Design a protein around this ligand. Structure first.
Ligand code: MG
Ligand code: MG
Ligand code: MG
Ligand code: MG
Ligand code: MG
Ligand code: MG
Ligand code: MG
Ligand code: MG
Ligand code: MG
Ligand code: MG
Ligand code: MG
Ligand code: MG
Ligand code: MG
Ligand code: MG
Ligand code: MG
Ligand code: MG
Ligand code: MG
Ligand code: MG
Ligand code: MG
Ligand code: MG
Ligand code: MG
Ligand code: MG
Ligand code: MG
Ligand code: MG
Ligand code: MG
Ligand code: MG
Ligand code: MG
Ligand code: MG
Ligand code: MG
Ligand code: MG
Ligand code: MG
Ligand code: MG
Ligand code: MG
Ligand code: MG
Ligand code: MG
Ligand code: MG
Ligand code: MG
Ligand code: MG
Ligand code: MG
Ligand code: MG
Ligand code: MG
Ligand code: MG
Ligand code: MG
Ligand code: MG
Ligand code: MG
Ligand code: MG
Ligand code: MG
Ligand code: MG
Ligand code: MG
Ligand code: MG
Ligand code: MG
Ligand code: MG
Ligand code: MG
Ligand code: MG
Ligand code: MG
Ligand code: MG
Ligand code: MG
Ligand code: MG
Ligand code: MG
Ligand code: MG
Ligand code: MG
Ligand code: MG
Ligand code: MG
Ligand code: MG
Ligand code: MG
Ligand code: MG
Ligand code: MG
Ligand code: MG
Ligand code: MG
Ligand code: MG
Ligand code: MG
Ligand code: MG
Ligand code: MG
Ligand code: MG
Ligand code: MG
Ligand code: MG
Ligand code: MG
Ligand code: MG
Ligand code: ZN
Lengths: 49, 104
RNA sequence: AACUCUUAGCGGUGGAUCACUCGGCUCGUGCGUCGAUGAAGAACGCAGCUAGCUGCGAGAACUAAUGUGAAUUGCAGGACACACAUUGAUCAUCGACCUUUCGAACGCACAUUGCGGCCCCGGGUCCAUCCCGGGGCCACGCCUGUCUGAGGGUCGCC
RNA sequence: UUCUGGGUCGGGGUGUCGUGCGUGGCAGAGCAGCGCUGCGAUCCAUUGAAAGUCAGCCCUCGAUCCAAGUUUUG
RNA sequence: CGUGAGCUGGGUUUAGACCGUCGUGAGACAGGUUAGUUUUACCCUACUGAUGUGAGCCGUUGUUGCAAUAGUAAUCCCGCU
RNA sequence: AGGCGGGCUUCUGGCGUCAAGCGCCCCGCGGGGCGCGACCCGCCCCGGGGACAGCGUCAGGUGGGGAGUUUGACUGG
RNA sequence: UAGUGACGCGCAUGAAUGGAUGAACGAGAUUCCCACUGUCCCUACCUGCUAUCUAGCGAAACCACAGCCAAGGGAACGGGC
RNA sequence: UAGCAGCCAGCUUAGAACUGUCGCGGACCAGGGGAAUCCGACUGUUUAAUUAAAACAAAGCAUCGCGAAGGCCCUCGGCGGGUGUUGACGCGAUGUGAUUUCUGCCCAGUGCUCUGAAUGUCAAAGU
RNA sequence: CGGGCGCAGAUCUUGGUGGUAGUAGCAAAUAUUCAAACGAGAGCUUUGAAGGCCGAAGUGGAGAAGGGUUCCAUGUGAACAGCAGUUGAACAUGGGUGAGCCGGUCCUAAGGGACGGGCCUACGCCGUUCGGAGGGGAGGGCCCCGCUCGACCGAAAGGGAGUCGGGUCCAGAUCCCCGAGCCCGGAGCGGCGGAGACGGGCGCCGCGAGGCGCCCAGUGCGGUGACGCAAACGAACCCGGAGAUGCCGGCGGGUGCCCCGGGAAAGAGUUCUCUUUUCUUUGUGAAGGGCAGGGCGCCCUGGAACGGGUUCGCCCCGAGAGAGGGGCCCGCGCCCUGGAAAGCGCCGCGCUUCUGGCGGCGUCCGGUGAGCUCUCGUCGGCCCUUGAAAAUCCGGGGGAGAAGGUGUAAAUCUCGCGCCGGGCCGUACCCAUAUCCGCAGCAGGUCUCCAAGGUGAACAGCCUCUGGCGUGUUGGAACAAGGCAGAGUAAGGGAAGUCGGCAAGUCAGAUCCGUAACUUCGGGAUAAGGAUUGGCUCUAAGGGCU
RNA sequence: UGAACUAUGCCUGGGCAGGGCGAAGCCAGGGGAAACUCUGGUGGAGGCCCGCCGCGGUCCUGACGUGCAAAUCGGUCGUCC
């Protein structure tokens, strides 16, 4: 909600920075071995609790 | 006619979430949160039902910034006892102390 | 003509089979070491470009030291690196140093980065109060000793 | 797909409901201003008027248009 | 004992509850009484209709017909004389 | 743990707070201290029970409150 | 065969396992009457959304092989013999 | 002086004339009614997802325990804890189910309870 | 020689693929339509117009819990959004939440839970204001201060000092900018001003305005009173007040909204005919000063029966009414400071990324109402229901103490003003027929605030304005059967249907009449049974003010 | 390991149009010899009545029944100081 605690807001900040797409240069570095981040979550499909 | 909304997070009609309508210089009608009404002091006698006179009716912590003359009267028990019960305490104290002289 | 079925060729769908193996499983051997000097675990953070994993802790993808002796690598690029000869790239080892917050977790508490106290230091204040910043401390149980005490509890001397 | 033929409007017939807007009235419970004028549901005349009527009603021959070319077959 | 993916649930035939009788009791009743979810067809035949199909092609296409065979239907009463 | 054992408040919906007073002593007219006021002595704070309640452990009775289990077979179902 | 009022040797009514009664009350059970109505005689017509057709999109239950009948026998009711 | 003049202000009620095709709560909103029987007095509650009822509750009535070292009940346990910030007009345990009118006979059986070492049966310990 | 050694079955396990099958289906809440722009591409995006719905218990505007970037701008149209897409809550790249006075923080409510003690073989548990040698603040220079003290946690709806007006962004806002305040904390000089501060009595200089010596005052003052003055010393201790009291009903004051009257001003709409017409806009914050208005078992004078005063109702009076004169409290209303400079409305000029700026005028005069809400008061009603604690703040009692000796001192409840400081955390957005939960953009579920015009008793139903929306996971063409629904309609009969009046049909508002059996006398009752109802033109009655 | 659903209790907050019958109390006018009565008005009581939101879920045994939904939808209906 709008009323958050510092620990909850610090927990939502990390999950927001983990949900970023894989960098483009990582794909060429690994030779298309890691093409997409296998931990991408959607705010409608997956809930973090 | 406009339908105005609250101005704070509290969205319930509690005892502290009381508002009133005020007309701003911008030709609008917005809510204006009012403080709870104060109560004048009561007599220490516990008999007279009416409140005391010559004393402001504000909140408790508002009495910290008021001057002393705005919180009592110039009588003996002013601010803590009504005038009718003071003159009865004077007569009762004098007449009882007189019967204790007759016994001697 | 179509449509349906059968057989074979080719092409799809699908993933079997075979070959491969830095994994597992089992047995044997040598050691057999955690922690209030803050452990295990957890949280957050750390790369020029970095999500994850791994590695680290505001000195954060590693510092010093020693051995090794020319690289790191995806693209960069730039090295107090290289013609080591301004005693060293990388790796390994690891006797120095460092190691945020929670956690036995330790001022009191925690769905709170909440609320305190003592001492010392610098600044604002310069009239030592107050304010800000920094550092050292303040949990429980128990042992030895010191200090300060308490009770006609048992006495001594007046 | 031109002895022409086929549509769209219009006209007439038919039938349905029921007397249109406007205008006129010394018709109108009345009422308000200076005989007159204004307000006023309704009523009367124009007015069996008005409206709509094949889209699956009937007949015109008035108006104005249209005439092209899918696939296949011995 | 035709017929609940045809219906209606009245009866019977879960769980609620009442009475009578029976049992120390929990409970029983082939006794009475009240309230109690009735699910699915788009598949294959059958049937009802609806396109179309002999394709072998100097046959294609149209009109007028014939008919195998199958269905088949009428029933009963009153009044007058 | 506020007056136990032994030889001063009833007329009123007032007031009551570390002693006035007296005695004695110590310092620089200004301060301080002590005793009486506020009796003396004592072994448990004051009351109510009291070797009975109660506690520990054996013994008998009660115990579907609770636990475990059982509730034969043949058979024109 | 229902409902109500009576009759009572009542399989098996009965007194706080409460008897009798009861104004008001009830989305409780039941009977009759008035009004009303397509519940019915006896079905017909109109409308909306579907079904239907089409562009796009696009499942599932189910499935031994499968799917015309009569009789016979048979595990005593075949689809196959 | 059986009060009048001026000015201002709304919203309702009653009666009457006229009038349209006897139509007028014109849409909308919006109780069918009556005579009786059974059960429960009533309001309330209940089987979330088949049973909303006649079941449960209920006020009323009646019985039962207990004066605190107590009645009822909890905990492995503290003579700890609940009723209890309580004290019989109270708390705990039951049946009936408002009001009206009544509530009959039976204590042999089962159960509860009282009497008592004055007599049988009768453990451990002791003799 | 050693085995994890041979599959058609086990409603076998895992993976894959068929028939059904281009089939069922994309059918709840009235609706779309024409043109244009962008574009390879348009029933679906965007703009304009037309026609409609939600109709203020909204399909509107904002929150709590929850979600956690879904918020905002640009770009893309692979996947996803059950048709499409030039679109998105999708994907990609950037950006976004600013506080002394909003809330957390602070307080204890239920309750949780340490300490002492007891218990458990033990990890631990019981218990919570009781129980221990549980007191580490205050004062007098070394005395004495503490029983109510039993740690502490526990409310983003309880208690709780103090922020409001205008403007600004693609997204922020009581937080930013501007303007105007306020509260709390801080001061041996706490920086000034004012208060405390009012002077008298004896002799002389003296015929004077004044000046010399002594002595004595002075911790404010006014009013008969309620009580008022800018201040107006005061400890321990005690007492009291506020914080801090339910539900319901009647009435009154004030705002907001609605309505009416200006033949008011400024724009707009309508004009075929009429319409001095119709629609929109006409303003003031917190804080302070003043005054209306409301309330008062508040004071003084006085004295009541022929009792009087008074409310819608009540209630009040010799324990003292009525009347006359005063006091206090609440004032969120009006005037003023703020403050018109600003905000809206209209007009003109300059200008097209400094341009995105400068000027003019206006912002007016009244009325009431069974109107609706909110709020402040006041009088009642109900209870075998009495309807919270604490932090914190204040007054009084108390007179221990401190202050100076003739002009000041002690002390000042800012007492007029000045000086400094206010840390930490939350802050975007959705809040629901697509941002929450139900596997989803699920006809379900989920706590609140604001709320207009007409009809009407109504917050009912129907229609409209502000605001919002495209009909709720798709378009087009048909109108067969059979369904669901419109609670569609019906000749004559009227329950003959059926287990059964199931179903829906009649009745329905309001006014005036009229209402039985039975009953616990309350009821039954809107019993039953009749009449009236539109429109229009009049009449009569019900008020206020001078 | 769970009382984010639900059952009960506690603390602290919020909410419940418009109408109807109309009880005690009070005022006035009539009847009385007193006991005490009658009419109108006032007043606004209630686990009172019609009824919106709310909260419930009767009937159609309607819709739906590989649904919008692993319990929902429509009309009707109970209650609403
Ligand atoms: Mg979700
Ligand atoms: Mg409200
Ligand atoms: Mg063959
Ligand atoms: Mg094959
Ligand atoms: Mg192949
Ligand atoms: Mg550490
Ligand atoms: Mg006409
Ligand atoms: Mg046709
Ligand atoms: Mg037979
Ligand atoms: Mg049969
Ligand atoms: Mg069936
Ligand atoms: Mg059958
Ligand atoms: Mg069958
Ligand atoms: Mg049945
Ligand atoms: Mg039967
Ligand atoms: Mg049964
Ligand atoms: Mg039976
Ligand atoms: Mg058993
Ligand atoms: Mg068993
Ligand atoms: Mg047997
Ligand atoms: Mg045998
Ligand atoms: Mg019959
Ligand atoms: Mg009979
Ligand atoms: Mg019998
Ligand atoms: Mg019997
Ligand atoms: Mg019986
Ligand atoms: Mg009723
Ligand atoms: Mg019922
Ligand atoms: Mg009935
Ligand atoms: Mg009921
Ligand atoms: Mg077969
Ligand atoms: Mg009978
Ligand atoms: Mg019967
Ligand atoms: Mg009942
Ligand atoms: Mg059920
Ligand atoms: Mg009994
Ligand atoms: Mg009963
Ligand atoms: Mg008996
Ligand atoms: Mg007996
Ligand atoms: Mg094997
Ligand atoms: Mg196999
Ligand atoms: Mg639809
Ligand atoms: Mg609605
Ligand atoms: Mg981003
Ligand atoms: Mg967006
Ligand atoms: Mg874009
Ligand atoms: Mg799509
Ligand atoms: Mg976008
Ligand atoms: Mg995204
Ligand atoms: Mg706290
Ligand atoms: Mg609060
Ligand atoms: Mg915003
Ligand atoms: Mg200050
Ligand atoms: Mg002076
Ligand atoms: Mg002075
Ligand atoms: Mg001075
Ligand atoms: Mg309160
Ligand atoms: Mg309260
Ligand atoms: Mg009131
Ligand atoms: Mg008077
Ligand atoms: Mg004082
Ligand atoms: Mg916000
Ligand atoms: Mg949707
Ligand atoms: Mg049909
Ligand atoms: Mg039908
Ligand atoms: Mg008919
Ligand atoms: Mg029949
Ligand atoms: Mg019949
Ligand atoms: Mg019916
Ligand atoms: Mg009746
Ligand atoms: Mg309440
Ligand atoms: Mg009734
Ligand atoms: Mg309702
Ligand atoms: Mg409802
Ligand atoms: Mg229920
Ligand atoms: Mg329903
Ligand atoms: Mg059904
Ligand atoms: Mg179906
Ligand atoms: Zn008094």
């Amino acid at each position: 909600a709008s009323h958050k605690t510092f620990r909850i807001k610090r927990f939502l900040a990390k999950k927001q920075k983990q949900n970023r797409p894989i960098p483009q240069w990582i794909r060429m570095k690994t030779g298309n071995k890691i093409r997409y981040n296998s931990k991408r979550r959607h705010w409608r499909r997956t809930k973090l609790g | 006619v406009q339908r105005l909304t609250y101005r704070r997070r509290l969205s319930y009609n509690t005892a502290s979430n009381k508002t009133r309508l005020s007309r701003t210089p911008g030709n609008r009608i917005v809510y204006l949160y009012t403080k709870k009404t104060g109560k004048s002091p009561k007599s220490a006698c516990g008999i007279c039902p009416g409140r005391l006179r010559g004393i402001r009716a504000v909140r408790p912590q508002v009495l910290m910034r008021l001057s002393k003359t705005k919180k009592h009267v110039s009588r003996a028990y002013g601010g803590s006892m009504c005038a009718k019960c003071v003159r009865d305490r004077i007569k009762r104290a004098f007449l009882i102390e007189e019967q204790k002289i007759v016994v001697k």
